[PDB]
Amino acid sequence: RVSTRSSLAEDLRAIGLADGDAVLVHAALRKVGKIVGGPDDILDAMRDVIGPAGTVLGYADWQLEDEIRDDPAMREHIPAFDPLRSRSIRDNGFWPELIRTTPGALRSASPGASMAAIGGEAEWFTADHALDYGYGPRSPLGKLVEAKGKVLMLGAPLDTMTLLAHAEHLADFPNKRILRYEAPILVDGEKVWRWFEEFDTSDPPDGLADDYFAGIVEEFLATGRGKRGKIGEASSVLVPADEIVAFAVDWLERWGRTAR
Amino acid sequence: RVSTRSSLAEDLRAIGLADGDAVLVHAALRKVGKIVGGPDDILDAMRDVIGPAGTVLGYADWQLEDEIRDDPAMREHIPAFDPLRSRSIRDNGFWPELIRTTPGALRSASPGASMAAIGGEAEWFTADHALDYGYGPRSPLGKLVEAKGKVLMLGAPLDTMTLLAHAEHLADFPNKRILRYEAPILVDGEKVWRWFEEFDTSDPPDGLADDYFAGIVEEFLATGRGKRGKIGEASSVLVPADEIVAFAVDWLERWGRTAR
Ligand SMILES: CC(=O)SCCNC(=O)CCNC(=O)[C@H](O)C(C)(C)COP(=O)(O)OP(=O)(O)OC[C@H]1O[C@@H](n2cnc3c(N)ncnc32)[C@H](O)[C@@H]1OP(=O)(O)O
Numbered sequence: 001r002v003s004t005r006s007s008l009a010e011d012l013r014a015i016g017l018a019d020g021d022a023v024l025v026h027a028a029l030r031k032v033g034k035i036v037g038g039p040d041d042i043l044d045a046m047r048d049v050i051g052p053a054g055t056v057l058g059y060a061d062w063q064l065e066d067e068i069r070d071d072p073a074m075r076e077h078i079p080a081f082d083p084l085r086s087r088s089i090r091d092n093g094f095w096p097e098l099i100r101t102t103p104g105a106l107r108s109a110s111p112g113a114s115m116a117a118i119g120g121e122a123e124w125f126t127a128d129h130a131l132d133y134g135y136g137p138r139s140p141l142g143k144l145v146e147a148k149g150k151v152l153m154l155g156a157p158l159d160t161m162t163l164l165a166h167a168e169h170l171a172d173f174p175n176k177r178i179l180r181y182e183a184p185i186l187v188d189g190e191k192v193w194r195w196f197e198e199f200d201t202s203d204p205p206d207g208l209a210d211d212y213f214a215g216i217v218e219e220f221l222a223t224g225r226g227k228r229g230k231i232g233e234a235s236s237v238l239v240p241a242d243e244i245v246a247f248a249v250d251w252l253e254r255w256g257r258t259a260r
Numbered sequence: 261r262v263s264t265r266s267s268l269a270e271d272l273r274a275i276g277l278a279d280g281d282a283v284l285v286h287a288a289l290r291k292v293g294k295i296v297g298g299p300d301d302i303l304d305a306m307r308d309v310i311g312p313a314g315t316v317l318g319y320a321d322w323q324l325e326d327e328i329r330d331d332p333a334m335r336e337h338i339p340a341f342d343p344l345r346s347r348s349i350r351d352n353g354f355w356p357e358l359i360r361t362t363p364g365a366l367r368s369a370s371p372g373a374s375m376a377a378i379g380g381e382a383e384w385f386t387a388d389h390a391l392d393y394g395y396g397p398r399s400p401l402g403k404l405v406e407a408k409g410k411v412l413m414l415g416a417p418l419d420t421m422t423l424l425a426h427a428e429h430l431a432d433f434p435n436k437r438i439l440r441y442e443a444p445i446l447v448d449g450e451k452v453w454r455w456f457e458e459f460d461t462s463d464p465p466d467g468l469a470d471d472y473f474a475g476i477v478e479e480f481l482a483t484g485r486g487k488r489g490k491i492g493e494a495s496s497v498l499v500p501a502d503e504i505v506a507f508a509v510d511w512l513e514r515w516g517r518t519a520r
């Protein structure tokens with residue numbers, strides 16, 4: 001079975017992508033199977049479906065390891081985060097690099113939370129991304145909710161849905177672990193070390209498993225409010241951003257009130 | 261032992277890179293070893309050594325496979341070669357992709373022979389790349405010789421020195437295999453299939469081994485006119501482009517006169 005730009009576009013329309021949509025995609029590209037024009041056919045087909053005014057996103061992050069950021073002897077040899085040159089974290093697969101290196105793509109400024117975006121509103125989604133609490137309202141994720149966008153899990157494991165970290169941020173529950181770290185960025189065109197602060201997106205709230213995002217998504221799909229479908233050979237899920245965030249905040253806040 | 265932008269720069273100086281140099285690099289990056297800022301440190305270090313007027317090149321090619329290209333049923337789903345969008349052939353390693361996706365880089369128009377270039381003369385090296393016989397004088401390889409540039413095998417096996425296919429083009433020896441194939445390119449901004457003609461660069465001249473480039477390089481190094489040295493943990497070779505081509509034309513033409 002071989003996918004084409006044409007056939008991938010019909011698979012994306014079948015799962016629910018439509019004209020003007022903004023969609024953040026998480027992908028395990030190897031699950032799509034054989035593609036005539038390679039994985040670029042997927043991005044091209046998406047843009048065919050949503051049109052030039054739509055926007056595709058991918059979770060770029062960057063490749064600074066904590067083993068490295070923290071080892072002080074290597075401190076001066078670590079390049080600053082540069083949203084135009086820092087490659088995406090390889091843990092998130094080729095897909096965000098695919099977007100980031102496509103002509104016309106943009107990438108936001110908050111390093112660990114940084115998002116790549118292409119399409120009509122890429123300038124809007126990537127701009128004014130808060131350095132601290134980069135998963136809150138002033139981020140591509142918060143604008144995805146405001147713009148009533150969607151999340152596509154393209155063969156990706158369901159617990160890699162980064163949008164639910166934005167739910168973690170909004171949700172009121174006790175003893176949110178705050179994380180503080182120091183990373184090099186650009187200030188006035190020069191490398192500067194800056195202290196960051198965010199809610200922890202690396203580990204779950206104490207008392208839930210590392211993969212509980214997957215459970216939340218499966219509960220949301222159980223309500224019938226999402227859509228499952230095949231993109232190429234990859235089993236995929238399309239959910240509305242605003243609904244799943246409200247769903248996830250609800251879940252987290254109720255779980256929080258079960259404390260003593 | 262970990263490499264840095266600084267330490268790779270000193271390694272590149274030790275092997276013979278100098279201000280203003282134009283260097284086409286073939287790389288097996290995995291055996292550079294650990295690099296603090298990843299393989300982009302190598303390119304940054306090269307640019308530190310050669311300066312903004314120097315030029316780094318990598319051999320991009322592109323990804324259209326003969327299986328697909330030849331298959332008539334998928335001919336219409338095969339995207340045209342776009343020097344701005346078509347990713348590098350993956351069996352040349354990450355290095356040409358690394359250059360091609362670096363801001364400011366350029367890429368030439370002859371698909372199978374196409375070269376990515378960044379630096380002071382990148383416009384000149386990538387301009388006017390002949391579609392037929394893309395390894396002859398009107399190519400980045402011909403301009404490398406004219407500019408008296410260099411080739412650096414950065415941990416790469418010596419028989420991957422594509423510059424020697426330019427020597428194959430020049431060398432007068434009998435019964436050169438001519439290759440004819442068709443491939444989709446951009447004409448007037450739209451996809452058009454075009455027939456191509458070149459000397460064979462995928463198979464050696466009848467009567468030589470698939471890796472005879474390696475033997476030529478090793479015998480050139482035995483004249484004393486190349487330099488060996490380690491870039492990071494990778495065994496590397498630096499040769500002048502003009503001399504090795506003249507050396508290889510000599511070798512091929514003498515081998516050709518042993519017929520009859
Ligand atoms: C809680 C959080 O926030 S987690 C953060 C977000 N994480 C994510 O979004 C990740 C979602 N994906 C996953 O979790 C997947 O399981 C991941 C990526 C580990 C693994 O996915 P897999 O498909 O192995 O890998 P990936 O998605 O990179 O696809 C690889 C396909 O690349 C194509 N590809 C990669 N690079 C290129 C290229 N340069 N040119 C052409 N094709 C390429 C290939 O077909 C490659 O596979 P191959 O190695 O067989 O050739």
Ligand SMILES: CC(=O)SCCNC(=O)CCNC(=O)[C@H](O)C(C)(C)COP(=O)(O)OP(=O)(O)OC[C@H]1O[C@@H](n2cnc3c(N)ncnc32)[C@H](O)[C@@H]1OP(=O)(O)O
Binds near residue numbers: 285289420422462
């Ligand atoms: C006849 C002809 O004309 S032949 C044509 C020319 N051919 C060439 O120039 C190829 C020369 N190289 C070779 O032959 C080598 O043996 C090749 C590439 C097969 C194999 O090289 P190897 O190092 O495996 O592979 P490569 O050079 O791609 O280095 C790989 C890695 O680089 C860095 N890497 C790759 N992608 C990224 C990325 N996205 N971000 C950061 N680093 C990356 C990594 O460390 C990745 O390795 P890992 O998988 O261990 O993490």
Ligand SMILES: [Cl-]
Binds near residue numbers: 254257
């Ligand atoms: Cl309740």
